[PDB]
């Protein structure tokens, strides 16, 4: 009876930096995945372990919507079995990922004349991220073995890096808002279905 609030996710006013990616759980509602899949707004709408076509025939315990901004160059990384700064240090999907990656170009909102540098990605981490892990640390990162604790040397780095979103940049360098929908089928009853 209740329509799932996908507008609150896809049409949000502000968007998280990828390092601090936002998550919204949705349940106890009904979703028509083709009003979205057949909207012409989205530049990328790919799924994994499931197929975009049959999305309404499926029924899940809960669905998670994760949203954030990255470069166009890095939409390839929001995928199972990928590596690179984003998959490695920012947003990791599991290799048995079931769900959908939806992305659209957002130059018109997320850049400014002179450049928008409000979006951050993590450049440095001691280890790769486990699937769906989320690190918002600002601890100084030690590169090499000269220690950084206390008095801090040259090989000591603030972990987060600004994106430089210039209006005139190449389409790979431009910001993309990205939504990942994860389909959690448990051993409990289903709450998110098709029409």
């Amino acid at each position, epitope marked *: 009876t209740n329509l799932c609030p996908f507008g609150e996710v896809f049409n949000a006013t502000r968007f998280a930096s990828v390092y601090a990616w936002n998550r919204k759980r949705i349940s106890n509602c009904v979703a028509d995945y083709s009003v979205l899949y057949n909207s012409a707004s989205f530049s990328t709408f790919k799924c994994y372990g499931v197929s975009p076509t049959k999305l309404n025939d499926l029924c899940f315990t809960n669905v998670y919507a994760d949203s954030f901004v990255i470069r166009g160059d890095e939409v390839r990384q929001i995928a199972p079995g990928q590596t690179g700064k984003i998959a490695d240090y920012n947003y990791k999907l599991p290799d048995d990922f079931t769900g959908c990656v939806i992305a659209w170009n957002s130059n018109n909102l997320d850049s400014k004349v002179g450049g928008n540098y409000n979006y951050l990605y993590r*450049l440095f981490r001691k280890s790769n991220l486990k699937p769906f892990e989320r690190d918002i640390s600002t601890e100084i990162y030690q590169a090499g073995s000269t220690p950084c604790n206390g008095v*801090e*040397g*040259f090989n000591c780095y*603030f972990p987060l890096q*600004s*994106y*430089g979103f210039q209006p005139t*940049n190449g389409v790979g*360098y431009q910001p993309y808002r990205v939504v990942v929908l994860s389909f959690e089928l448990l051993h409990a009853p289903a709450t998110v279905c098709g029409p």
Partner: nanobody
Amino acid sequence: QVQLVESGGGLVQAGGSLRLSCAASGFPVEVWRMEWYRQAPGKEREGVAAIESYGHGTRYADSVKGRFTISRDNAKNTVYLQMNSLKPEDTAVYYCNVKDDGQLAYHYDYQGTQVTVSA
């Protein structure tokens, strides 16, 4: 359009003082970490000092802590390196760099400024 211009340097007696400036064009110097490197003759490049984005800290090599001071002028879009208590092993060519991580179409590696400290 994006460019890094070093200025200052020259000849100074040991114990002397000097200030090098790095004038950036095409981006704001506060957004990313900015660095000073030096390459003595017949040695490899060494990291001297760095100032992180947005006042997230400064970093100083052991060789020059307490004698060198790095700073940002957001109005002049310029990073400065004050050089005090100059020892002679501080003789090198000095280079500034942006740790932009590919976030701008840079032509990444490029002139430098020579500093010479007498005995």
